[PDB]
Amino acid sequence: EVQLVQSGAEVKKPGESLKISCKGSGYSFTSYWIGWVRQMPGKGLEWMGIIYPGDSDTRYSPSFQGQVTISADKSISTAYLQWSSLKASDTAMYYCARYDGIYGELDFWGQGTLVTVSSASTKGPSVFPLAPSSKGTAALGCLVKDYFPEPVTVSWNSGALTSGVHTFPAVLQSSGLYSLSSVVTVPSSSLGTQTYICNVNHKPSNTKVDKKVEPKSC
Template sequence: EVQLVQSGAEVKKPGESLKISCKASGYGFPFYWIAWVRQVPGKGLEWMGVISPEDSSTRYNPSFEGHVSISVDNSITTAYLQWSSLQASDTAVYYCARLLVIFRYTSVYWRFLDSWGQGTLVTVSS
């Protein structure tokens, strides 16, 4: 059974750093991409970025690029989402999800997010 288990809720102050995790199990971790999705309270889903665990290549939503960093540790089948300096506007629930992709010729197409973590609530407040 595919499972993505995320780290627990965090309460931080503006300017602090944070790294949250997403532990995958039940499938070949290097061969499926991982996406991170944000949901601000009362708002919709926003795609933040994706990573290919096989080569650690990343792609970010321009709205988040430079503010967050996505990484993986294949040895422990875990993906991470990291901030160096949090802002109050980062208060949200963050989900990791397994992204199925398909390669056609020289292009890769993102098909869908088939399994999701339970979410990590990050609260940033002074």
């Protein structure tokens, strides 16, 4: 079958250069145009440009003309998207897609490459308790604060607790660091006996943390 495979996620700093790739297989790569599509976080799809790998004939969308270079290496069935100087506003998911010339549809898509551009540096999270009451449905949780970059993983009781768990999307703080909460609703009668521990892992900084969450004393 037709497949488009894109290179791995990128975390970069402003002013750095970058070239991401897209390899086609299961068809003649030099026979079809390949498009590049930008998707900013929580935003819509934007056409960036297109290339015919047979001869590297290229069209750019006016908004991306002079901003990026689209290229291809047909000897290895690969199309490229590149920046010489990244900006934080380049943060986005980038898709490559095959264009079929008859009706102009994009019929097969790559899995996407996530590019994160920030002046922030790698930093492990601090994990703070969201404590349940010490005096019915109760809520408790963990605040996973001041980390970079995404992602973190959160489990409860090493994966033994999944019911009532909500792990929220992270927010980006003005500091450029992320903050995330993970909560669980439980019976208030379980609070005295049942142990609740959040298991947090942040691979990029190699920071692994277990935080026991319990009612506080006054």
